[PDB]
Design a protein that fits this description.
The chain has 297 residues and is an alpha+beta fold. The protein contains ten helices and ten strands. Bound molecules: kanamycin A (KAN). This is APH(2'')-Id.
Length: 297
């Protein structure tokens, strides 16, 4: 955590944008990586909470400029950029505001069936197009290879938990990693650009028309397994549940649905380990103790 006042936000912005005059500023959201501010009701400026989140913002800015007119839904559009320092790769970025509310599982399920299904269709089309974007211009650094990531998590957990876990417990952790890594189904996919945080909170909805009017938060995007972007929608109360995602899958013409379920299941078990790592790497320490406690069971 770094934290900001309105005067700091304004001065950072005035420095690089001296002719953009500012009336209203108020906090609009706050994520793991950035705080968001609404300026003149027409712009959302993200300011990083730490270096990690700044690097996330920098990556978001860059992917958006590559895909800005390639999708069938609106996406955030970058209008203002800050600067790199020794602490942040980018001090802030200002985006066009997208009107709408999050498409919560509550909101979704109270829609008439016809809108519900059109939502599934519109999401499938957004994903099918996103996953078909040609990635060849893209920086090779965006490639998230899932085998390497898992091998790397195993060593980070070992390094982190070696003094915290009893020998037999750490053996069982090594067992779970070995087991995941021997199953080829997690690691044979054709990589493509994926949103990689595709969930109900990043899907915006227009309640006058009852249709999806935007997709937001591209800070996690990578070139990786297209199946990541369904599994993040599958969790029953938290997200949409299986019946809805299966409609999305059918529109997307997915060919190996039992593969997605399998990755979903493993992902959900994998959450405890993500809570430990992601706790420390995002220095949020109640996740850490929680994951560790789940692991000791
Ligand atoms: N109790 C909260 C839930 O949290 C996880 O999922 C949630 C993600 O954590 C959120 O996002 C953050 O974590 C992501 C991992 O995907 C990263 O991409 C990103 N840096 C972060 O912004 C996402 N928007 C909503 C989603 N429901 C678990 O899977 C789930 O079991 C658990 O119930």
């Amino acid at each position: 955590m770094r934290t900001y006042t309105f005067d700091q936000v304004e001065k950072a912005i005035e420095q690089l944008y001296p002719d953009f005059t500012i009336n209203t500023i108020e906090i609009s959201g706050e994520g793991n990586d950035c705080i968001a501010y609404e300026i003149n009701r027409d712009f959302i400026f993200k300011f990083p909470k730490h270096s990690r989140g700044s690097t996330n913002l920098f990556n978001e800015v860059n992917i958006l400029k590559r895909i800005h007119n390639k999708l069938p839904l609106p996406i955030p559009e970058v209008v203002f950029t800050g600067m790199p320092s020794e602490t942040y790769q980018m001090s802030f970025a200002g985006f066009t505001k997208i009107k709408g509310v999050p498409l919560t599982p509550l909101l979704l399920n109270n829609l008439p069936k016809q809108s519900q299904n059109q939502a599934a269709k519109d999401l499938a089309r957004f994903l099918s197009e996103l996953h078909s974007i040609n990635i060849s211009g893209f920086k090779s650094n965006l490639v998230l290879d899932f085998r390497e990531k898992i091998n790397e998590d195993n060593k980070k957990i070992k390094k982190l938990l070696s003094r915290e876990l009893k020998g037999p417990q750490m053996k069982k952790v090594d067992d779970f990693y070995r087991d995941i890594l021997e199953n080829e189904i997690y690691f044979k996919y054709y990589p493509c650009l994926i949103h990689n945080d595709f969930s109900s909170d990043h899907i915006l909805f227009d309640t006058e028309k009852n249709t999806i009017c935007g997709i937001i938060d591209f800070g996690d995007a990578a070139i990786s397994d297209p199946d990541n972007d369904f599994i993040s929608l599958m969790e029953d109360d938290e997200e949409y549940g299986m019946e809805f995602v299966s409609k999305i899958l059918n529109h997307y013409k997915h060919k190996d649905i039992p593969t997605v379920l399998e990755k979903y299941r493993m992902k959900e078990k994998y959450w405890s380990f993500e809570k430990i790592i992601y706790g420390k790497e995002y220095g949020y320490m109640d996740w850490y103790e929680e994951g560790l406690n789940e692991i000791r069971s």
